[PDB]
Structure 1
Amino acid sequence: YDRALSIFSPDGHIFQVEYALEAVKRGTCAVGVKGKNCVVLGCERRSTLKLQDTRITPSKVSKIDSHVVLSFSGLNADSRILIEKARVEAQSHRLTLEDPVTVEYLTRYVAGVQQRYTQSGGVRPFGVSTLIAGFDPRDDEPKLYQTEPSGIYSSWSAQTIGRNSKTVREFLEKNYDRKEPPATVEECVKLTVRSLLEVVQTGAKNIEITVVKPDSDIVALSSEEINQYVTQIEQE
């Protein structure tokens, strides 16, 4: 078996990459905003249906490392496969190179799973896009990367993927700047909360926020915290 499930196109394309990006489109929305002393990945959560126990329901942000976080959009089945594989990569940088992973290493690795399925047959690339962010050890520089299901990656200052990413992108043109990112943890967090309240809306019940602070600090902001930012921003 090696019967192409990825095959070249008459436009000089690959069919499965075009389909993959649309599979990332119809999935959830991720916004990534990086300050000078934090990264923030806030993402859309499907918990619309009632009688769902939101607490034991899978998160949209999964920590891979004690200061490297990963959030996802696209198929929810595929993302969890990557997140098991990344965890192996994380222990392998420690194994042979010591030190926990750099953000940049992990970005090339996710992409390298995608890459594999892109050139070979019997496999197809996952319809998954990620926002990878965090610190490298002994750095207090925020890193914000994006991977896409092609096997391509891009650095960003801000990025958004998912549904109505263009609305959010334009909102951050008028707020966020490459030149001077927010100089505070809370200001960054509130800008990501403000962007999500456009499209995702629907309180702190669908809106999540994860904050990483420099050099081995992962903290999660509970529903209650998220709700307090929501009301203040609404009023303002």
Structure 2
Amino acid sequence: GYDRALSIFSPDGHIFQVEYALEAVKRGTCAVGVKGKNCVVLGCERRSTLKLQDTRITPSKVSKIDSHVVLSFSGLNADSRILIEKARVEAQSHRLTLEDPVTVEYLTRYVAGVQQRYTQSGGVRPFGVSTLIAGFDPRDDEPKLYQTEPSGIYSSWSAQTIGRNSKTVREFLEKNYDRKEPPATVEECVKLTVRSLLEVVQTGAKNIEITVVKPDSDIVALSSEEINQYVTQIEQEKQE
């Protein structure tokens, strides 16, 4: 079999294939995660360079791993499918053996472990993908939001963004997100998420996707019109 060490150390102690995988993430469309008091909202950018797209069937940016956990990403789309499939299999495997669905932290730890493995295995390149994994632990009402990256490191975030111009939207979130008082309702959380994307997106039309996850496997994706109402209300307050 092909056994070539593609991910190796350089004289300055860097693994360039892992660092170049991050550059693929930088190119990917912007993804953002914001957790409220009783919800987590995942926002995703859709580049409007592609119209004539069939939005019914085109792969959506947010994917359910189980009924209670979701995964969004920035980077190589094809790479993300492999991580999503593995995560979904592991979620069912966990239910089968432990007789309990995965915690959000466990699922994150698994996906992050797969990514790490691809940074020191022979004959493979790292995933050009960073993920945002969000949901609620079984029988728990505390919101969970985690981030993973090609190197395989992962951590918990009150709010986070990944992808292109994520530096700008992180700037926004860092000054607009208060830890002592997170977005107390679904409305407030979705509003803050749409606001953060409007710093970067362009037109607030079909360029913004929003998915809301609530406790006890309550996950719903907002439609164009519902999001459009947030876009409308935000700029009308801005004209002042």
- TM-score, normalised to structure 2, is 0.95
Report 1:118-133 matches (<5 A): 118-133=119-134
How far did residue 128 of structure 1 move? Answer: 0.4
Distance 2:175 2:117 in 1: 39
Partner of 1:171: 172
Q: Deviations over 1:139-165 (max 9, x none)?
A: 000011000010110111111111111
Q: Secondary structure at the match of 2:65?
A: strand
SS at the partner of 2:212? Answer: strand
User: Which is worse superposed, 122-131 or 172-181?
Assistant: 172-181
Q: 2 CA distance for matches of 1:189 and 1:117?
A: 35
SS in 1 for 2:119: helix
* In structure 2, C-alpha distance between the alignment counterparts of 1:163 and 1:120, rounded to whole Å: 28
Partner of 2:83: 82
**CA shift at 1:215, angstroms?**
1.4
Q: Spell out, residue by residue over 1:158-194, the C-alpha distance to the aligned partner (whole angstroms, 9 max, x if none).
A: 1111111111111112211222211111100011011
**Could you tell me which residue of structure 1 aligns to residue 98 of structure 2?**
97
Name the CA distance, whole Å, in 1 between partners of 2:162 and 2:221.
Answer: 21
- Per-residue CA shift, 1:94-128, capped at 9, x if unaligned? 01101111100110111111111111211111110
Larger displacement relative to structure 2 (136-145 or 116-125): 116-125
Matches of 1:71 and 1:202, distance apart in 2:
21
SS in 2 for 1:71: strand
Asked if the contact 1:133/1:143 (under 8 Å) is kept, the reply is yes
Aligned to 2:116, what secondary structure does the other structure show? helix
Distance of 2:16 and 2:57 partners within structure 1: 37
Aligned-pair CA distance for 1:47:
4.2
* TM-aligned CA deviation for residue 6 of structure 1: 1.3
Alpha-carbon distance between aligned partners in 2 of 1:102 and 1:44, rounded to the nearest angstrom: 27
Specify the SS of the correspondent of 2:11: coil
Compute the RMSD of aligned alpha carbons: 1.2
Structure 1: 5+ residue stretches without partners: none
Is 1:72 equivalent to 2:66 in the alignment? no
| CA displacement, residues 2-22 of structure 1 (integer Å, 9 cap, x when unaligned) | 111211211112121110111
Give the Cα–Cα distance (whole angstroms) in 2 for the partners of residues 19 and 50 of structure 1.
29
CA distance in 2, matches of 1:9, 1:213: 45
Mapped to 2, the partners of 1:51 and 1:96 lie a distance apart of 45
C-alpha distance in structure 1 between counterparts of 2:189 and 2:86, whole Å: 30
Q: Distance in 1 between matches of 2:20 and 2:171?
A: 25
Using the alignment, how far apart are the partners of 1:106 and 1:152 within structure 2? 13
Question: In the alignment, what sits opposite 2:226?
Answer: 225
CA contact (8 A) 1:48 1:206 kept: no
The CA distance in 2 between the partners of 1:84 and 1:173, in whole Å, is 33
Q: How many residues align?
A: 236
How many angstroms does 1:29 deviate by?
Answer: 0.5
Q: Distance in 1 between matches of 2:121 and 2:14?
A: 15
Determine if contact 1:47/1:54 at 8 Å carries over to the other structure: no
Distance 1:122 1:48 in 2: 35
SS of the residue 2:19 aligns to: helix
1:34 deviates by 0.3
Residue range with higher mean Cα deviation, 82-91 or 199-208: 199-208
Gap runs ≥5 in structure 2: none
In the aligned structure 2, how far is the partner of 1:204 from the partner of 1:68?
A: 27
Instruction: Give CA-to-partner distance per residue, 1:36-64, whole Å, 9 cap, x none.
Output: 10000101113432211122111110111
TM-score, normalised with respect to structure 1: 0.97
Give 4+ residue runs of structure 1 displaced > 6 Å after superposition.
none
The answer to whether the 8 Å contact 1:61/1:210 transfers is yes
